Amino acid sequence: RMKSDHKRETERVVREALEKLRSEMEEEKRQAVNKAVANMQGEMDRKCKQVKEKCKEEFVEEIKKLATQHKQLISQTKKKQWCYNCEEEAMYHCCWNTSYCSIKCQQEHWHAEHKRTCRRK
Amino acid sequence: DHKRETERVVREALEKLRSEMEEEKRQAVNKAVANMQGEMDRKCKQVKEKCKEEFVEEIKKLATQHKQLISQTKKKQWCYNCEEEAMYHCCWNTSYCSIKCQQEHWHAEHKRTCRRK
Amino acid sequence: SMPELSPV
Amino acid sequence: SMPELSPVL
Ligand SMILES: [Zn+2]
Ligand SMILES: [Zn+2]
Ligand SMILES: [Zn+2]
Ligand SMILES: [Zn+2]
């Protein structure tokens, strides 16, 4: 009677011990996964910030180059006379702030607005 | 007695189950890490490419703006001396913001080239 | 009425 | 001989 009860005894002790360990190992597993993933996240993100910000700085420097180029071109533009109708360089002077590259442009701007505004003697 | 037996077999069973489940754990960790690896790389390339396209778009906005500022500049008269807006007309391509600038430029070079009356 | 312009 | 200039506007 006892050679049977000892066997049953042992069996149930084994069962509940294995269930308890299995559960423990399950959420120990889940936490190990959480740790590895949370660390890996940060490594990836950090690398990402580095590359991205290097690119952003290249962009800023390029923008500043462009701005400088524009400044110089503004000055050069300020040292020239331009057709008011189209925006090619001017060769004919009508009156104040009103010059033209050609007679065609002169006529166009004339009929468009300059007729009512020409201050030429 | 019986307790020694039970304790023995239970202990060794726990060691064997633990042994197997830690291999399961190693495999689950490796899987998760590989999944986020590829995922973060995809998200990364995605963000970098959107940011670079943002750069291109900004470059083009700036180009357009610059063009319009060039046009506005072309539709105005400027002091030959300080490049501020002109208020006095001398002759062709030669206007000034002030009498100061006029005389400065005059004695500097414009005596020799003035096409005025 | 459009002024006759010459090149400068 | 520097010309006296008048304002344009
Ligand atoms: Zn024109
Ligand atoms: Zn005119
Ligand atoms: Zn000036
Ligand atoms: Zn002059």
Residue numbers in the entry:
A (entry chain A): 441 to 561
B (entry chain C): 445 to 561
C (entry chain B): 381 to 388
D (entry chain D): 381 to 389
Which statements did the authors publish about this structure?
BS69 (ZMYND11) is an emerging tumor suppressor that was originally identified as the Adenovirus protein E1A and EBNA2-interacting protein. Nevertheless, it has been reported that BS69 interacts with E1A, EBNA2 and a variety of cellular transcriptional regulators through its MYND domain, which recognizes a common PXLXP (X denotes any amino acid) sequence motif present in many of these proteins. One of the key proteins in driving immortalization of EBV-infected B cells is Epstein-Barr virus nuclear antigen 2 (EBNA2), which regulates the expression of many cellular and viral genes.
The crystal structure of BS69CC-MYND (residues 440–562) in complex with EBNA2381–389 was determined at 2.4 Å resolution. The structure of the BS69MYND domain reveals a ββα fold that was observed for other MYND domains. Two zinc finger clusters, formed by a Cys4 motif and a Cys3His motif, respectively, are arranged in a cross brace topology. Association of BS69CC-MYND with EBNA2381–389 is mainly mediated through hydrogen bonds and van der Waals contacts, involving a surface area formed by the α1-helix and β1-strand of BS69CC-MYND. Notably, the side chain of BS69 Q546 forms direct and water-mediated hydrogen bonds with the backbone atoms of EBNA2 P383 and L385, respectively; and BS69 M531 and H533 form direct and water-mediated backbone hydrogen bonds with EBNA2 V388 and S386, respectively. The three conserved residues in the PXLXP motif of EBNA2381–389: P383, L385 and P387, all make contacts with BS69CC-MYND (residues Y532, C534, Y540, Q546, W550, C558 and R560) through van der Waals contacts. Additional intermolecular contacts involve the residues flanking the PXLXP motif: EBNA2 M382 makes contacts with BS69 Q546, Q547 and W550, and EBNA2 V388 is in close proximity with W536 from a second MYND domain within the same BS69 dimer. The engagement of W536 from the neighboring MYND domain in the BS69MYND-EBNA2381–389 interaction implies that the BS69 coiled-coil domain plays a role in enhancing the interaction between the BS69MYND domain and EBNA2.
